Amino acid sequence: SMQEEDTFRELRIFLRNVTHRLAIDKRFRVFTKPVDPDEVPDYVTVIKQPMDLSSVISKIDLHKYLTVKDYLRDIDLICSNALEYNPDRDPGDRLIRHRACALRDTAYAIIKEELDEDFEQLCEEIQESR
Numbered sequence: 001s002m003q004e005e006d007t008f009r010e011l012r013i014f015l016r017n018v019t020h021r022l023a024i025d026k027r028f029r030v031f032t033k034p035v036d037p038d039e040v041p042d043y044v045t046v047i048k049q050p051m052d053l054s055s056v057i058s059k060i061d062l063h064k065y066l067t068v069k070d071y072l073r074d075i076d077l078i079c080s081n082a083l084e085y086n087p088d089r090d091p092g093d094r095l096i097r098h099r100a101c102a103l104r105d106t107a108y109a110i111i112k113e114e115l116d117e118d119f120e121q122l123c124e125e126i127q128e129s130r
């Protein structure tokens with residue numbers, strides 16, 4: 001229905017706003033762009049599902065997220081990919097992991113404060129009906 005289409009359009013506006021607020025935070029600058037393949041050629045071999053906030057925006061605009069749960073799976077993926085590629089005790093790796101964990105925690109905290117549980121539930125029930 002047009003009412004269901006209006007629901008998913010509201011979800012996209014909400015997800016763009018959350019992603020924008022993460023992307024303008026100076027802590028998260030590294031996560032705003034895909035890994036430069038000329039700068040880091042082995043990334044695409046080690047990390048099987050690369051994800052970054054620019055790709056998250058692309059996926060919102062392509063209607064790939066029908067629930068906030070599906071969006072948070074991609075936020076979780078930025079965090080897990082960061083922990084996987086940068087696992088060492090050195091401060092460079094530890095800073096990336098702390099920033100990755102913070103990006104994930106911030107996304108979940110915004111959604112906890114600002115997502116209506118009944119809105120997510122409606123998205124889930126429209127998704128399941130298809």
Ligand SMILES: C[C@H]1CCN(S(=O)(=O)c2cc(NC(=O)CN3C(=O)N[C@](C)(C4CC4)C3=O)ccc2Br)C1
Pocket residue numbers: 029030031032033034035036037039040051052077078079081082083085086096100
């Ligand atoms: C190579 C490491 C860096 C951190 N991780 S990550 O897995 O946490 C990760 C990185 C990225 N994007 C970028 O790194 C984009 N970028 C570059 O390719 N080079 C510069 C200029 C800078 C890094 C030297 C930069 O910012 C996106 C997502 C993750 Br999860 C991979």
